[PDB]
Write a protein that binds this ligand. Structure first.
Ligand SMILES: [Ca+2]
Ligand SMILES: [Ca+2]
Ligand SMILES: [Ca+2]
Ligand SMILES: [Ca+2]
Ligand SMILES: [Cu+2]
Ligand SMILES: [Cu+2]
Lengths: 720, 718
């Protein structure tokens, strides 16, 4: 019963290290750190001995293992990283069984139409309160599991609710005027449609394209210009931008400028072709995969935890130090962090009921035909959860990460398993604290952070989201941006060319005939923080320079002007990093009679210029439709139905259905259930260093405990 | 033969025994060693080493040759360090040179008995001769020269010596300059307070039983134009006192409203300032864990089993496309010099010299024990001197290389700081990534080289990271930790009568203790030479402009670009939404764009940001330190202008730093410029920062902007 170890392990996804000197094999895979000596009747798993009936065999310089090796060793039980959940958590995402079950319920529905698509199949949230009672009192929820089924019947949106427990269809509801998000088959349609269009073919041949089979299209939302674009609000449309495939594995580097096709997805036809001046396609091969590069040798570097991880994953609940939280996946927004508690000397304190991406937008600034309408709502319009990019083990996440698989429903209602969907990893983050008192023994502690990382790629854009749990109570939310730049074909080769000036009015000349058009990356996070309870108040603390009225030589002082933010409209604001914004529990105080709070920091830095607001005049539509892009901070009363900053059905939206609507009522934020919305972004002005591929650029956000604790949270257990 | 564990742990080597594989894994800096008991060979950084004497196990205790460490760690297999046959001209003064410099000034007829040395540093050869050495290996063909600054009681004298020729080049007393605080100043203060009956009396009033338990702190007094009632003439220090309650944290027991002014020359207290009696906060607040038990953790290691990607030849560090010189200064700490980027076999100049410029920690309380607090920790206390030896694995990751550094003490005697600087490479997420749908992923990991330095002055612990990104970006982060300077107050809780007044200038972080609001302002002096000496400052302001091109759009995203022509205009506030470049108007990239470096003074922070000086413009602190209120500064290169706060900041009556350097408002058009980045925080306290402060960080960045012709990390073309 034997197999060549090296192949089997690689294929298994285990890292295999052979030590000639020590005559030892080191195998690493997620929480499992294994040591095995050829011929040995014992293997070490996370520092624990494991008897092998069939030893590893070295034959003719090749290692061989039993057909049972991987299972016996990896799934030995010595790897305690993953545990079995006894009592299922109320927020566990729909299982593949439940997905199939939900699809069969609506399919067996009277009104179900064949060819209906599933934009989203998600767990319908149990009552927030029953869920907290479950997490804190382990009180069973006791309301049937329900699933939300959102379908696209051609261009129409219907909303169904299925009672899974009972296998019952609870509601069927047509949603008038709403457009559905772009589904994967849309991509294939656009390309086919362009391929079959005779006129298109003609437009491309007059633009110097010899092989019209070499044209690569991209499916783009058209937005809404109040008909100004000349597009019927009624039609299910997509704009089409095309590139030429020159085989360098980078079509994005070969734009066919000033050629736009409008596709009626309902009609499966090209309803309009916008042609502008002819710009020769930049033809030079610009591979980013290294196919033309010399691969330099670097010395090995590995981060190891030879005895296993400090965290435990039981079902979807992650336990690490004083942190407890539930981790699930949504096809639209991706990762969802729930029932986040902080174990304070045996008392689990509520920090966040649920936290997740709210939505995002990538608006362009070029008014030309191939650009003016670009303002991507990649989660809303494209489904970021669905588009998750599997973690490239060790490059995308450090070598000591644990990679989780996540299951979602595809647009057809068939369960889909995303491999290495989320990376979980503990990391050294410098000294937690230090004090080297003169002529005294040093006092230093190392800082440890638990990172939850997720990557989603939409078109040319690659997004990385890190949910960072600081051992001291702080929570960081970082977002990195990489991928390939959306570029404009231009005549200028250099800034010395006559068209250079006009060519670069809207972006930098990053290569010969290539302009990296300016745009912004705007991210919004939806954080339902419950600071040591549900009832919270928004408080402002503005550090000010006030005149010295107390005497002495000082002409001024540093004081703070503190005040509550009473309702939603006042809560919706720009964030001055020089100021302090707390979410406090007016009902609970720390040892000093100070209200337990969390400090909200929407702007904690970045590596690209900061997006001060949306870089759109206020008379602009995009600007209108989407208010979330302009304020950095928003606070709203908790509504189980208000989850998207851009609104639920942003495709060709005619008005603010997102944050503009949620606060529109200007309700009270006094001693009530608040939801924090943090907006952060970059203004991306290009440079040659970002072509052919872009270096990840990061933006940081932070949530810090503020009088939440009574002292340094990391000091340690008192022996007193 | 010796006990291996002892010998090794005594050597500073980490020892791991693997009972399963019967293997010893020994680590120290760049040395990654694997040895098996009884083996005739060992492994050093992946290379086999013949052993004279195999490791011997006795009583299940290992034994080694008294030659082992040498034989193995100094084998030559660990190539982390290399021999420097031609010393770099910026090499810092050696112990011998420190000793010889001291001899030379002591031999002058002018040397006064009891003279102290505030600073003894290299007077480097000329900037062009240094660049010629680094780039062309052209010898400076010069004699080492040293700058020797002495404190004759309270008098500053500046001398220059020629180390080869062993001669005094100059002797120059500095009129009106006060010298920085020397270590001995610390003990004279305590001593002087101890001997003061009056002082002892004041303490007595204040409820202090044993005056022997009183801990003083020697504080700079600044300059109030005489409103502090202090003579400008006198060498003074103010004294704040704490009571030692045996918790190892005197800082937690302030004696409020008792201030003593000491004349270090007269060696006596010249003034006692008494305010209202505030009982001393007595509750024991140890920060050293004497009272705690840490939660057990599973081991984590970062190993580089084949050694490091960098080489250290003398002080020359070579890593990937980066080449730079690291040296120590007693005032400012580390100096990063002759920084070049090896662009496909061609070294392009990035930075002639970069270091800490200076820094300030100014308080916002107008009260007697606070109003004067404006700590210039590097200029006034010597941060390089006060370097905190890295706590291996805690202060820096387990894969760091800890360097020892030598400077001169205040008596002119060489002083070697162990684990002065940490050098470490780290995984920084994906360098770049593109997961083209339905295609094989394209991902690369990002690697960063960090040069970390910690300095502790009084209650503050300062961490500085000089981060080399493989892609050409240079990051500069500053971490802040330690113990907070607190105020004793009568309120125990926010519900006390006095709670409101008590907290007027800071948060109530403990019973009877207020973390007094203050700022942390860092200034970095960066002599960037972007692909050359002659550069220009260019503003690129992203703007929304009305659309004139047609179609449905009302507006467009454009840039307002223009040159910043002189020092006054270059002296400004930084908008993180704008772009500031240092361009070489003499060189461009393949797209005809001038090679540049994007300057980012504010790249983020974990504490509220200091947008300016949290001071009224009529404030004396404000007047003296202009650097505090502008985030960006650019001045013409001048070897004598290195400090934001000026050379002699103690009791300065006016700005002799950046205020003076740009004063003349010279042109910055196609000339040798020096960038100064001011970054800060506004620290409003929390209970979570007491009794020890969780490290807070600030970030700054320098990114290549059209310096390259493409992604700098794709690699060489096949
Ligand atoms: Ca509302
Ligand atoms: Ca809430
Ligand atoms: Ca320069
Ligand atoms: Ca000048
Ligand atoms: Cu971008
Ligand atoms: Cu501080």
């Amino acid at each position: 019963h034997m197999v060549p170890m090296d192949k089997t392990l690689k294929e298994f996804g285990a890292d295999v290290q052979w030590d000639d000197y020590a005559q030892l094999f080191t195998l690493i895979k997620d929480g499992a750190y294994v040591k095995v000596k050829p011929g040995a009747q014992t293997a070490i798993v996370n520092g624990q001995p494991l008897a092998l009936q069939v030893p590893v065999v070295m034959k003719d310089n090749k290692a061989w293992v039993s057909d049972t090796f991987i299972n016996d060793v990896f799934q030995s039980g010595l790897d305690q990283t993953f545990q079995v959940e006894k009592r299922p958590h109320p927020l566990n995402a729909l299982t593949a069984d439940e997905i199939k079950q939900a699809v069969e319920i609506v399919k067996a529905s009277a009104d179900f139409k064949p060819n209906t698509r599933f934009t989203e199949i998600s767990l319908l949230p149990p009552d927030k309160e029953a869920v907290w009672a479950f997490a804190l009192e382990n009180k069973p929820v006791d309301q049937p599991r329900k699933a939300d089924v959102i379908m696209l019947d051609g261009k129409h949106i219907i909303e169904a609710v299925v009672d899974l427990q009972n296998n019952k269809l609870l509601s069927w509801q047509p949603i008038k005027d709403a457009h559905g998000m772009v589904l994967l088959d849309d991509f294939a349609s656009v390309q086919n449609i362009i391929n079959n269009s005779e006129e298109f073919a003609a437009a491309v041949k007059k633009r110097g394209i010899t092989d019209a089979k070499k044209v690569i299209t991209t499916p783009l939302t058209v937005g809404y210009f109040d008909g100004k674009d000349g597009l019927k609000q009624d039609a299910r449309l997509l704009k089409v931008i095309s590139y030429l495939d020159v085989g360098d594995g980078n079509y994005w580097a070969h734009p066919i400028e000033n050629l736009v096709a409008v596709v009626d997805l309902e009609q499966k036809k090209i309803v309009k072709i916008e042609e502008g001046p002819v710009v020769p396609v930049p033809m030079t091969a610009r591979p980013f995969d290294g196919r033309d590069r010399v691969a330099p040798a670097v010395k090995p570097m590995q981060i190891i935890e030879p005895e296993g991880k400090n965290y435990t994953i039981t079902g979807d609940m992650i336990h690490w130090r004083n942190w407890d939280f539930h981790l699930s996946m949504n096809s639209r927004v991706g990762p969802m962090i729930s029932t986040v508690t902080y174990n304070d000397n045996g008392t689990k304190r509520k920090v966040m009921y649920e936290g997740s991406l709210g939505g995002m937008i990538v608006p362009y600034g070029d008014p030309d035909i191939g650009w003016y309408f670009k303002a991507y709502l990649d989660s809303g319009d494209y489904g970021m959860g669905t588009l998750t990019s599997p973690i490239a083990r060790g490059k995308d996440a450090p070598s000591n990460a644990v990679l989780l698989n996540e299951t979602i429903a595809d647009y057809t209602g068939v369960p889909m398993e995303i491999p290495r969907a989320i990376a979980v990893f503990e990391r050294y983050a410098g000294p937690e604290y230090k004090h080297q008192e003169m002529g005294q023994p040093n006092v230093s502690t190392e800082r440890r952070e638990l990172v939850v990382r997720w990557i989603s790629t939409v078109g040319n854009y690659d997004y990385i989201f890190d949910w960072i749990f600081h051992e001291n109570g702080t929570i960081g939310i970082d977002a990195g941006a990489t991928g390939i730049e959306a570029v404009k074909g231009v005549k200028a080769k250099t800034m010395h060319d006559e068209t250079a000036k006009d060519d670069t009015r809207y972006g930098t000349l990053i290569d010969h005939n290539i302009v990296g058009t300016t745009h912004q990356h705007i991210y919004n996070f939806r954080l339902d923080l419950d600071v040591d309870g549900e009832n919270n108040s928004l408080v402002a603390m503005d550090p000010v320079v006030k005149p010295n009225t107390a005497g002495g030589p000082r002409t001024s002082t540093m004081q703070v002007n503190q005040y509550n933010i009473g309702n939603e409209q006042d809560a919706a604001q720009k964030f001055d990093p020089g100021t302090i914004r707390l979410l406090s529990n007016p009902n609970k105080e720390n040892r000093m009679g100070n209200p337990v709070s969390y400090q909200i920091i929407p702007y904690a830095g970045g590596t690209h210029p900061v997006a001060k607001g949306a870089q759109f005049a206020p008379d602009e539509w995009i600007y209108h439709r989407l208010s979330f892009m302009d304020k950095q901070l928003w606070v709203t009363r908790y509504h189980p139905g208000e989850r998207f900053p851009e609104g639920k059905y942003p495709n060709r939206s005619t008005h603010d259905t997102g944050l503009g609507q949620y606060s529109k009522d200007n309700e009270s934020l006094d001693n009530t259930d608040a939801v924090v919305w943090m907006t952060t972004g970059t203004t991306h002005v290009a440079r040659a260093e970002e072509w052919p591929i872009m270096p990840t650029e990061w933006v940081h956000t932070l949530l810090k405990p503020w009088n939440f604790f009574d002292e340094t949270p990391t000091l340690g257990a008192l022996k007193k």
